[PDB]
């Protein structure tokens, strides 16, 4: 089983592995801590026995909605990143991170959408968040470093 809690300082070494055994953007330390420092209420780690095995960085933002068609300022959720280690996956975690940093994006930051970028040929990642209600809004052509297409994809809060 797992739990949940707020990312703290001393999680980052292992989260930052988990980044780089999962996903091939692979953002420096101080990107961590600063996203930590700023957006940490919304902020997760999943715990199994003490170790860090999934994580949810967020960043929160104002400017223009992306769910409305023609120009509306809003507060707004982003996911920067969020990853679970191959041996935990299926059990619920990225789903409950979600939620918990969903509930404080709203509740702590006064976001009224959250919004990702996912790669087109994310088929687990995309299951996920349609299953949480996402809708595809665009597609952000040549969006990753390969030239590989992301949806955005947002749902209000
Ligand atoms: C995408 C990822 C975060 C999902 O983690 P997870 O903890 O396994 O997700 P959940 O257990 O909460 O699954 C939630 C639902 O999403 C869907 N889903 C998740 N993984 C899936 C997969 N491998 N194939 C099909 N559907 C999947 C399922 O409907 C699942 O519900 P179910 O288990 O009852 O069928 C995980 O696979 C991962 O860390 N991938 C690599 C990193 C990554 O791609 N991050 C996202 C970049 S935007
Ligand atoms: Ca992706």
Do not use: C
Request: no cysteine.
């Amino acid at each position: 089983d797992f739990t949940l809690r707020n990312a703290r300082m001393d999680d980052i070494d292992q989260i930052i592995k988990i980044n780089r055994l999962t996903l091939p953007e692979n953002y420096p330390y101080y990107f961590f801590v600063e996203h930590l420092k700023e957006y940490g209420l919304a902020f997760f780690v999943a715990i199994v026995d003490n170790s860090v095995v999934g994580y949810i960085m967020p960043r929160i933002e104002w400017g223009f909605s992306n769910i409305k068609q023609l120009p509306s300022l809003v507060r707004k959720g982003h996911v920067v990143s969020i990853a679970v280690l191959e041996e935990y996956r299926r059990k619920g975690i990225a789903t409950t991170l979600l939620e918990a940093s969903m509930k404080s994006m709203k509740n702590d930051y006064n976001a009224e959408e959250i919004y990702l970028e996912v790669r087109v040929s994310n088929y687990p990642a995309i299951a996920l968040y349609e299953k949480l209600n996402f809708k595809k809004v665009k597609v952000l052509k040549g969006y990753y470093a390969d030239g590989e297409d992301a949806y955005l994809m947002a749902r209000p809060l």
